[PDB]
Amino acid sequence: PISKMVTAHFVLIHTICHGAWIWHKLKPALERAGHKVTALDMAASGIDPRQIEQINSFDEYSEPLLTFLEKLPQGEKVIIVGESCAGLNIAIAADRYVDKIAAGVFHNSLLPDTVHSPSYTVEKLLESFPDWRDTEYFTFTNITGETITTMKLGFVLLRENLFTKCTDGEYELAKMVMRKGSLFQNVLAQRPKFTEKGYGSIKKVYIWTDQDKIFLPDFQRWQIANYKPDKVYQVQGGDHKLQLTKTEEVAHILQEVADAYA
Amino acid sequence: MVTAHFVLIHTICHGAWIWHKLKPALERAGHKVTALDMAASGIDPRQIEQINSFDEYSEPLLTFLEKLPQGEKVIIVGESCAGLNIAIAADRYVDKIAAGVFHNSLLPDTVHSPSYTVEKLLESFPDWRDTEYFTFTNITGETITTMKLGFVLLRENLFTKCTDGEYELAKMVMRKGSLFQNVLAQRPKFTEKGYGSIKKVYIWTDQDKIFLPDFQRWQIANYKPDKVYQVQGGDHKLQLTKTEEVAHILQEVADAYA
Amino acid sequence: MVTAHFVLIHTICHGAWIWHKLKPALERAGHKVTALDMAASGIDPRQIEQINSFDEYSEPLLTFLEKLPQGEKVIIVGESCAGLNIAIAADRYVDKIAAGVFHNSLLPDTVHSPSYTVEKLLESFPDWRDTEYFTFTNITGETITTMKLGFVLLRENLFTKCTDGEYELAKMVMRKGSLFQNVLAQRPKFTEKGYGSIKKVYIWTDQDKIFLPDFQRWQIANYKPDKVYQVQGGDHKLQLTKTEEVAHILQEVADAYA
Amino acid sequence: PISKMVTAHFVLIHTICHGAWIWHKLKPALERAGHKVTALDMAASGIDPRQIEQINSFDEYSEPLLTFLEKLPQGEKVIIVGESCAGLNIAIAADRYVDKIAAGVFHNSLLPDTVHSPSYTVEKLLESFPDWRDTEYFTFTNITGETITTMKLGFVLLRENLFTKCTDGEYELAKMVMRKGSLFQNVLAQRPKFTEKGYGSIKKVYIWTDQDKIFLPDFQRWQIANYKPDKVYQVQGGDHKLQLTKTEEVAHILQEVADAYA
C-alpha cells in the first residue's frame, strides 16, 4: 500500500564474561544495510580496563551503556540489542533513558519484568540450567559487604552449550578473550524492581532459537509467557550465539525491528 | 609428520586473538598450540604504563618457557614486532627452543643493537597515518612512547585483505602498545650463543602493506635466515588471509626441527 | 587484660614501618599485631599510578580481612588519612571488626560524602609547604593528584618532636601517595550498618602540627566517637613520640571491645 | 705536633635485601660531626621501584652507586662505606671511578681482592656460614640465560644472626622493609677480576666485631689475612649491624678515616 524501510542506530550489548567482540560479524552485516552500530564493552568485559572485583552491582557493570546513552544527542534514539544476561542491562538503561530507546531486542536473552525482583529471571535461568559444567566460581566482598560470586566459564560449557554450532575460529576466539563475570544475583535480589514508566514502556522484541543449549526452550518459552514481548522471532537452527551462527538472519530480523520502531 | 608444540606470539597492541584461525588449523594436524597474551595486550590485566621495557613486555612468554617441562622444546612463531620477543626469549632459553619463525616480522641480529630493525622499519614506513601517540615516564625515568593504532592504518595497512569480521574484531580488542625503542637502543645486543644459535625461518608476502617488500628483503639480506618462505598474495596478517598456507609451512618447520 | 589482634594502618606515602616501635610495645603485652603496607606504600611492589581509588589503595587491608579466620575480630588502628581505610574496611567487614581506633586521623562520617573530612583538613591546613604534586589519569579517565611530601613539612609538621633517627628513616622510605579526593567526592557515603555501627576510639594530641587542634576538635564535634583519649605533648606521630601511651590506650580499647 | 680534623662526604651502601634505611642512625650521627652523607638504595632494595627479577648482575644491581659517582663534581671525592655484601659494590665502583674515591670502608663486609674471581669471598662466606636457617630461596633466568638465586632472609636468621643485639624497634623495622636479594654468585664467577689500577689502588679500612653472628671471626680474619687492609678497626661487642648497635663508635672511627684519607 505504502512500504517503509528505516535505518537505525543499534547499540549491541554482550553478556557477562564476554565483550563487544561477540558482535564482530553482526556489526558489519548491519552496517552493510546502512545502519549505524555501536558495540560496547561493559565494565570488566572485553578490553575494558577494570577488573570484576572492583565492580559492585549489575548497575555499575552497566556504566558504559548508561554513559553512552547520557551522551546521545537530543532526539536521537537507539535500538539496544542484548544477548543472554544483557536483558538486565536493557532494563537498567530503560529506567534511566526511556526517552532514548526506540526498542529493546532480547537475543537468547533474559527478559526481565517489572512485577518481580530484578533477580527473578536469573533464579529461573538457574532452575532451568543449574549445572554450568566445568565453570569455576570465586567470590569477593563488595563495597557494602555483599558476597559476590564471579565465574570463569568452562571451556566444555563454552564448546557444547554456548558455542555449539560455531566455527572453530569462533570458539577459539572465545577462549582467547573470555573473562570473568558475575550475575550479581544477590545484589539484584536487593534491587528496586524495574519501573513501569521506564523499562515497562519500551517496545520489546524477543529473538531466540529452540536449538539453544544453555537458555533452553523451556526457559525461553517460560520467559515469553511470563512477560509477553511485542514481537517474538524464532530462528530455526543455529545455537546460543545466533549473531555468529545465524548473522544474516539476525540482521534481517533487526531490519524489521528498525522498520517497525526506529 | 612431526607434531610439534608451537608458541604463537602476537605483535604490540594485539593479543593472542590474532591467532584464533591459525591455532585450530594447526591443532587439526595434531600439533599442540599455546597462544599467549604479552603484558598489557589482549586480555592481560596490566596496563602499558606499568611495563618498563620490551623484556618486561615479554614476561608471559618467558614465564611460560620458564615452566616448560624439562626436555620439551617449542617452535615460537612471532608476527611483526614479535621477532624481538623471539630474540629476548632465545637468549634466556636457547635450550627450550626448536626454532624461531618470523611471520612478516622484525628479524633482529647480534651485530647491531636490539633497536636496529625498529629503526629500519620506521625508516621504510615513517608515517603510521592516523595512529595516536602518548608518553609516560617509566620507573627508571625513561620516557616511553605508546601508541593507539589508527583504524585507517588497521584497515589499509595491517588488515588489508582481511574479512570485514576480522577487521571489526581487530577494532573491538586492539590495545595500546609500545616499541620501547629507546630502551632497546640501550639494551645489550642479542647473544650469539642464545639467539644467534637458534634455527630461523622467515615467512612473508610481498603484498604486506606495512612491512614493505624492500624492508623485508633488506632484513633477509642483513641477517640470513635458515629458510625463507614467501606466500603469494594475502596481506600483513597472513595467519588470517593465508591461514592454511602458514599452517603448511609450520608443518615443514616441525618436520625440519622438533 | 584482654589480649587482642590489632591491624595497624599507616597513612598515604608512609608504610608499615611507622609502626616499628608500636608493634613490639603491643606484643610485649601479649597482643597479636599485623602491620600492613597499603598499595604502592612501604615496600609494596605497585606504583601509585596503577592505583585508581582509595578503595583500591585499601586492598591489602581488605584482603587481610577477607582471609581472617571465621569468628576472629580485630581492632584496626589508623593514623592520619588511614581513617578512610577504616571506614572502607568497616563497610565491607563490619562483622570482623571489634573497633576502629583513629590516631591523629581523619574521622569520616555517614552523613556527608567520603571526601568531606579531606576537604575540611585542606581547609585547616592548606599549604603543605615543600610537598610536590603530580597527576596521572586513572583507568576510567579521572585525573589523580599524587604528592611527594616535602622534607621540611616532614621535619616540622609530621615528625615534629621525633628523634633524628626516626626523621631520617622517614626520608629513607617515604613514597608518593594520593588522597584520590575527587574519586572520594564521587563515592557513595559510608553506610550506617557498616562503618556507622563500628565502635570508634579517637586518640590525638593538641601538639599535632599538621592535624591542628581546631580541626581535630571539629572532627570530634562533627561525628562523636565512643571514646576520645588526648595524649599530652608528642607530635603527629604519637606511635613514635608517645609509644607507651598509645600502647596503654590500646590495652584499654582491647579491654573495652575484644 | 700538627693535628688534623677533616670533614668528608660519606656514601653509605647497604647489603643485599636491605636498603638505605639501615643507615638511619649512622647518617644523623655523621651529620652531627659536620660530614655530608649520602645513603643510596641499590637496584630492587629499600624503596627502589625495580624488582630483583629485572636485575641481571651485581654490576647492574650497583647502578645507583655508579650513577651517583658519575654525577659527582670535578675533584669531589667520597668515602664509600659498605656493610656485608656491599664490599662488592665498592669494588665495582672503584674499577669505574677510582678518581672519586678517597677510601673504601668495609663494615663487617666482604673484602674482594684482584687476584681471585669476584665471587671468591662469597664462596668463602658460604663455606664459613652455609646454613641461612629459615631463609627461602627462589630463582629466575636472567637476560643471557643464567639461573639467578634470590632469597627472602628468614626472620630467625634476622633476629639471631644479623640483628642479634639490636633493639626491638630495629629488628621490627627490618622485618617491615626487608626485600629479596641476590648474591648473583654465578654471574660474579663469570666476571672479570677487579683491577689493580682501580679497585686495587683504593685505600681500604676494615671495621668489624668478633661478636658478629653471620660474618664469623674465622671468616673475617681470613679476609683480613687474604687481602691486607690499610687499617683494621675491631669494635668490641655489638653485632653484625654495628651501625645500629655501635653507631657512635662507628662514627668516631669514620672520623679517623676522614682525617687520614679525605
PDB file of N, CA, C and O in Angstrom, chain B residues 52 55-56 66 88 91-93 139-140 187-188 191 193, chain D residues 49-51 53-54 56 139-146:
ATOM      1  N   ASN B  52      58.041  -1.594  31.665  1.00  0.00           N
ATOM      2  CA  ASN B  52      59.102  -0.621  31.517  1.00  0.00           C
ATOM      3  C   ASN B  52      60.115  -0.902  30.422  1.00  0.00           C
ATOM      4  O   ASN B  52      60.993  -0.046  30.199  1.00  0.00           O
ATOM      5  N   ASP B  55      61.634  -6.327  27.455  1.00  0.00           N
ATOM      6  CA  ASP B  55      61.923  -7.550  28.183  1.00  0.00           C
ATOM      7  C   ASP B  55      60.828  -7.770  29.193  1.00  0.00           C
ATOM      8  O   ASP B  55      60.409  -8.915  29.331  1.00  0.00           O
ATOM      9  N   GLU B  56      60.330  -6.722  29.891  1.00  0.00           N
ATOM     10  CA  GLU B  56      59.194  -6.850  30.785  1.00  0.00           C
ATOM     11  C   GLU B  56      57.921  -7.181  30.035  1.00  0.00           C
ATOM     12  O   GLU B  56      57.103  -7.965  30.522  1.00  0.00           O
ATOM     13  N   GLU B  66      59.899 -20.631  31.186  1.00  0.00           N
ATOM     14  CA  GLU B  66      60.497 -20.987  32.443  1.00  0.00           C
ATOM     15  C   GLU B  66      59.876 -22.265  32.956  1.00  0.00           C
ATOM     16  O   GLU B  66      60.546 -23.130  33.515  1.00  0.00           O
ATOM     17  N   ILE B  88      64.634 -12.066  22.590  1.00  0.00           N
ATOM     18  CA  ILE B  88      64.729 -11.969  24.038  1.00  0.00           C
ATOM     19  C   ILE B  88      64.587 -13.363  24.666  1.00  0.00           C
ATOM     20  O   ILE B  88      65.353 -13.777  25.560  1.00  0.00           O
ATOM     21  N   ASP B  91      67.625 -15.814  24.010  1.00  0.00           N
ATOM     22  CA  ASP B  91      68.806 -15.586  24.817  1.00  0.00           C
ATOM     23  C   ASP B  91      68.729 -16.105  26.214  1.00  0.00           C
ATOM     24  O   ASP B  91      69.773 -16.338  26.838  1.00  0.00           O
ATOM     25  N   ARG B  92      67.503 -16.275  26.690  1.00  0.00           N
ATOM     26  CA  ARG B  92      67.288 -16.831  28.017  1.00  0.00           C
ATOM     27  C   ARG B  92      67.009 -18.335  28.041  1.00  0.00           C
ATOM     28  O   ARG B  92      67.206 -18.963  29.091  1.00  0.00           O
ATOM     29  N   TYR B  93      66.481 -18.928  26.952  1.00  0.00           N
ATOM     30  CA  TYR B  93      66.074 -20.323  26.975  1.00  0.00           C
ATOM     31  C   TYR B  93      66.472 -20.994  25.696  1.00  0.00           C
ATOM     32  O   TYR B  93      65.687 -21.819  25.229  1.00  0.00           O
ATOM     33  N   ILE B 139      59.762   3.454  35.396  1.00  0.00           N
ATOM     34  CA  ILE B 139      60.229   3.564  36.772  1.00  0.00           C
ATOM     35  C   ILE B 139      61.681   4.043  36.900  1.00  0.00           C
ATOM     36  O   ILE B 139      62.053   4.560  37.945  1.00  0.00           O
ATOM     37  N   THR B 140      62.510   3.905  35.870  1.00  0.00           N
ATOM     38  CA  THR B 140      63.861   4.370  35.974  1.00  0.00           C
ATOM     39  C   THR B 140      63.981   5.719  35.299  1.00  0.00           C
ATOM     40  O   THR B 140      65.088   6.222  35.120  1.00  0.00           O
ATOM     41  N   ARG B 187      69.870  -1.454  25.217  1.00  0.00           N
ATOM     42  CA  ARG B 187      69.967  -2.857  25.650  1.00  0.00           C
ATOM     43  C   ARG B 187      71.186  -3.567  25.049  1.00  0.00           C
ATOM     44  O   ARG B 187      71.568  -3.278  23.905  1.00  0.00           O
ATOM     45  N   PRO B 188      71.830  -4.496  25.776  1.00  0.00           N
ATOM     46  CA  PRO B 188      72.847  -5.341  25.228  1.00  0.00           C
ATOM     47  C   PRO B 188      72.289  -6.117  24.056  1.00  0.00           C
ATOM     48  O   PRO B 188      71.133  -6.544  23.987  1.00  0.00           O
ATOM     49  N   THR B 191      72.803 -12.172  22.086  1.00  0.00           N
ATOM     50  CA  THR B 191      73.983 -13.004  22.095  1.00  0.00           C
ATOM     51  C   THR B 191      74.006 -13.994  20.944  1.00  0.00           C
ATOM     52  O   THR B 191      72.985 -14.446  20.406  1.00  0.00           O
ATOM     53  N   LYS B 193      75.455 -17.042  21.439  1.00  0.00           N
ATOM     54  CA  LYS B 193      75.185 -18.364  21.950  1.00  0.00           C
ATOM     55  C   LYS B 193      73.710 -18.628  22.129  1.00  0.00           C
ATOM     56  O   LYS B 193      73.291 -19.776  22.117  1.00  0.00           O
TER      57      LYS B 193
ATOM     58  N   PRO D  49      62.206   1.118  42.908  1.00  0.00           N
ATOM     59  CA  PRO D  49      60.988   0.600  42.307  1.00  0.00           C
ATOM     60  C   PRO D  49      61.174  -0.686  41.527  1.00  0.00           C
ATOM     61  O   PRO D  49      60.227  -1.345  41.128  1.00  0.00           O
ATOM     62  N   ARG D  50      62.415  -1.028  41.190  1.00  0.00           N
ATOM     63  CA  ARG D  50      62.659  -2.203  40.397  1.00  0.00           C
ATOM     64  C   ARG D  50      62.432  -3.439  41.247  1.00  0.00           C
ATOM     65  O   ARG D  50      62.637  -3.378  42.466  1.00  0.00           O
ATOM     66  N   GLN D  51      62.134  -4.576  40.624  1.00  0.00           N
ATOM     67  CA  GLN D  51      62.057  -5.842  41.351  1.00  0.00           C
ATOM     68  C   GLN D  51      63.318  -6.622  41.095  1.00  0.00           C
ATOM     69  O   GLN D  51      63.881  -6.475  40.015  1.00  0.00           O
ATOM     70  N   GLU D  53      63.945  -9.587  39.922  1.00  0.00           N
ATOM     71  CA  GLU D  53      63.937 -10.430  38.745  1.00  0.00           C
ATOM     72  C   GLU D  53      64.235  -9.679  37.446  1.00  0.00           C
ATOM     73  O   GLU D  53      64.494 -10.263  36.395  1.00  0.00           O
ATOM     74  N   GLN D  54      64.224  -8.356  37.521  1.00  0.00           N
ATOM     75  CA  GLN D  54      64.592  -7.499  36.406  1.00  0.00           C
ATOM     76  C   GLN D  54      66.102  -7.169  36.492  1.00  0.00           C
ATOM     77  O   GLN D  54      66.597  -6.424  35.654  1.00  0.00           O
ATOM     78  N   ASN D  56      70.222  -8.160  36.453  1.00  0.00           N
ATOM     79  CA  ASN D  56      70.861  -9.340  35.903  1.00  0.00           C
ATOM     80  C   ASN D  56      72.243  -9.664  36.374  1.00  0.00           C
ATOM     81  O   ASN D  56      72.710 -10.755  36.058  1.00  0.00           O
ATOM     82  N   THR D 139      64.434 -18.759  42.164  1.00  0.00           N
ATOM     83  CA  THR D 139      65.273 -18.454  41.030  1.00  0.00           C
ATOM     84  C   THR D 139      64.483 -17.805  39.906  1.00  0.00           C
ATOM     85  O   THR D 139      63.260 -17.843  39.870  1.00  0.00           O
ATOM     86  N   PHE D 140      65.215 -17.170  38.998  1.00  0.00           N
ATOM     87  CA  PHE D 140      64.681 -16.674  37.773  1.00  0.00           C
ATOM     88  C   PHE D 140      65.841 -16.820  36.769  1.00  0.00           C
ATOM     89  O   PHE D 140      66.999 -17.053  37.147  1.00  0.00           O
ATOM     90  N   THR D 141      65.535 -16.752  35.475  1.00  0.00           N
ATOM     91  CA  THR D 141      66.533 -16.833  34.436  1.00  0.00           C
ATOM     92  C   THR D 141      66.812 -15.418  33.959  1.00  0.00           C
ATOM     93  O   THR D 141      65.885 -14.679  33.614  1.00  0.00           O
ATOM     94  N   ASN D 142      68.072 -14.990  33.966  1.00  0.00           N
ATOM     95  CA  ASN D 142      68.405 -13.616  33.619  1.00  0.00           C
ATOM     96  C   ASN D 142      68.504 -13.434  32.120  1.00  0.00           C
ATOM     97  O   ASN D 142      68.433 -14.427  31.398  1.00  0.00           O
ATOM     98  N   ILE D 143      68.930 -12.237  31.695  1.00  0.00           N
ATOM     99  CA  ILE D 143      68.965 -11.810  30.321  1.00  0.00           C
ATOM    100  C   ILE D 143      69.813 -12.631  29.349  1.00  0.00           C
ATOM    101  O   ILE D 143      69.568 -12.625  28.139  1.00  0.00           O
ATOM    102  N   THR D 144      70.750 -13.436  29.832  1.00  0.00           N
ATOM    103  CA  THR D 144      71.536 -14.232  28.924  1.00  0.00           C
ATOM    104  C   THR D 144      71.402 -15.675  29.316  1.00  0.00           C
ATOM    105  O   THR D 144      72.258 -16.485  28.995  1.00  0.00           O
ATOM    106  N   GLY D 145      70.356 -15.987  30.079  1.00  0.00           N
ATOM    107  CA  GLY D 145      70.076 -17.364  30.398  1.00  0.00           C
ATOM    108  C   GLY D 145      70.695 -17.916  31.667  1.00  0.00           C
ATOM    109  O   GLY D 145      70.529 -19.104  31.915  1.00  0.00           O
ATOM    110  N   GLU D 146      71.431 -17.151  32.491  1.00  0.00           N
ATOM    111  CA  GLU D 146      71.906 -17.644  33.784  1.00  0.00           C
ATOM    112  C   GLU D 146      70.830 -17.831  34.824  1.00  0.00           C
ATOM    113  O   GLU D 146      69.958 -16.970  34.930  1.00  0.00           O
TER     114      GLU D 146
END
